[PDB]
Design a protein around this ligand. Sequence first.
Ligand SMILES: Cc1cc(F)ccc1-c1c(Cc2ccc(/C=C/C(=O)O)cc2)c2ccc(O)cc2oc1=O
Ligand SMILES: Cc1cc(F)ccc1-c1c(Cc2ccc(/C=C/C(=O)O)cc2)c2ccc(O)cc2oc1=O
Lengths: 228, 210
Amino acid sequence: GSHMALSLTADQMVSALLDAEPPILYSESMMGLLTNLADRELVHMINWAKRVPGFVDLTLHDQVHLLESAWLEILMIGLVWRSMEHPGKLLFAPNLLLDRNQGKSVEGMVEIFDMLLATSSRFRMMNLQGEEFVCLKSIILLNSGVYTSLEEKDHIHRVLDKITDTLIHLMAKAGLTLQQQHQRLAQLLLILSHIRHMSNKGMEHLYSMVPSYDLLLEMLDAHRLHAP
Amino acid sequence: LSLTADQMVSALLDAEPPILYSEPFSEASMMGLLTNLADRELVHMINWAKRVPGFVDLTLHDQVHLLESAWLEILMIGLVWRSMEHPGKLLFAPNLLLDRNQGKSVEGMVEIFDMLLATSSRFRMMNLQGEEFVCLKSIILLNSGVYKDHIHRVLDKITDTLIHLMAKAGLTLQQQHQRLAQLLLILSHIRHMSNKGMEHLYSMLLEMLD
Ligand SMILES: Cc1cc(F)ccc1-c1c(Cc2ccc(/C=C/C(=O)O)cc2)c2ccc(O)cc2oc1=O
Ligand SMILES: Cc1cc(F)ccc1-c1c(Cc2ccc(/C=C/C(=O)O)cc2)c2ccc(O)cc2oc1=O
């Protein structure tokens, strides 16, 4: 059978997102290594993205739009998640744990590094859970590009409300008061604005030294050819 | 800090800057007109910043950084608010209502226009209220240069304040959290616009604060 996204309970949404997680990939000149990693991560992101409840309900063209706006933020949230148990360090991959100082070997890279580090330490001191993380990553995929067919927008927003509900359930089951539930949610959603900022600074940097709409369309298209 | 939700709102409503006026247009004239308008609003913005509860308690360094980081986001949300009832147009001032065609007269400008219009169309579709608006505007000032325990206390207070307005208007407990989220996710898109806007402006405080 098939569960429509707007029918999911909070626990079924959490279970769907946890089950969709991509694996942690390994690293194979700093930049060449990072690009290869991202490239490989990308193929997996696509598989993940189609398992986000509500995503395949959209037109294909709308799917690519959302993925074109969100892809670098998604890479980044994952990076900051992996880096959480390693203060001062970015875990690009387990064989590629880089610190602030190595970052200074690439011009302008330290600033983004420091932004990424600060986001990671904020997640750490907030004690972000795995179950919250997956909610935030999905929110990113659905939200980044939604402000740039009226039924598609409404549907995307209704799925966003569902993940929000799911985040509130997690916080209520963790014992937070209503005030605390609202404040932590707000705090998590503001971190998302900073992740957007990081992404834009990241993109500026990449264009100055990248998946287009057309490649992501092709990669989305290619997914349908995968052997199950 | 000590204030109630009512007092916070009241304070925010009282601190609101005025709507300024602009002083047929060419490209260079339209941009001079927008520049001079924004220059004039920045003065009032600094003044409004100082009346935001919690802001002057920060160090002057933190006050300058937040404002330097957030000024365009603030200009932009004020614009999107003003333009809300004007489908397909940006109300930069009552005497400077500009349509999508008018923005095509400067290289790169129209892309930002569309993004501003979408934001504005989104606040209309949501029925953004004045009191919610002022809360969001203050969240932007406190959030945009944030990444310190004190900033986050004020933020939590504004969150609480937004929720109380929502409660006051009869929204269920689920509707409240849903709406709060929908609004703070708009803040992501406003940050993005600011970034795009800054990029374009490179393709060309200490006093009022101290
Ligand atoms: C650290 C950094 C600085 C930038 F300034 C731009 C991007 C990054 C960055 C990369 C590096 C990166 C390098 C190249 C590309 C290019 C992709 C492509 O060409 O398809 C993408 C990311 C990254 C790679 C893998 C990953 O899991 C997370 C990451 O998070 C980041 O913030
Ligand atoms: C529409 C736009 C496109 C850009 F690409 C950059 C900024 C804007 C923009 C401006 C125009 C603007 C033009 C010049 C300057 C400053 C120039 C300078 O200091 O030299 C600032 C704003 C603006 C002006 C007043 C206002 O209330 C809101 C506004 O919102 C915007 O998004």
